[PDB]
Design a protein around this ligand. Structure first.
Ligand code: NAG
Ligand code: NAG
Lengths: 49, 49
């Protein structure tokens, strides 16, 4: 769903976040300090859910 | 301004030239000289702005 580009993804040089929703897309030329929030799944196996 | 205009800045020291139509805004320290300074902002390491 998402392609990210930039320089080290730190809040000292601006970067990008291009993501693809079901029927949308948003692009931000921003200076994100951090985005590492996978929201880890306890049931990551795709067999059940 | 009767005293001074500390509103508009500019860059004096950069590692290399910039490509046409490029914007580079950053607040860092320039590694002048042979001393690998790590944010001293003092002798032989000047603020580029
Ligand atoms: C994210 O995708 C859903 C899927 O329908 C959409 O409704 C929603 O507007 C999208 N979010 C943004 C910010 O576009
Ligand atoms: C699989 O997931 C469902 C709900 O998503 C849950 O009720 C069930 O206990 C899980 N395990 C099995 C073996 O069905």
């Amino acid at each position: 769903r998402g392609w990210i580009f930039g320089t080290t993804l730190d809040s000292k040089t601006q970067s990008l976040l291009i993501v693809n929703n079901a029927t949308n897309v948003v692009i931000k030329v921003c200076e994100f300090q951090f985005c590492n929030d996978p929201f880890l799944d306890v049931y990551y196996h795709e067999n059940n859910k | 301004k009767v005293s001074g205009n500390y509103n508009y800045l500019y860059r004096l020291f950069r590692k290399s030239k910039l490509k046409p139509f490029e914007r580079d805004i950053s607040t860092e320290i320039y590694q002048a000289g042979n001393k690998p300074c790590n944010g001293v902002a003092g002798f032989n390491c000047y603020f580029p702005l």
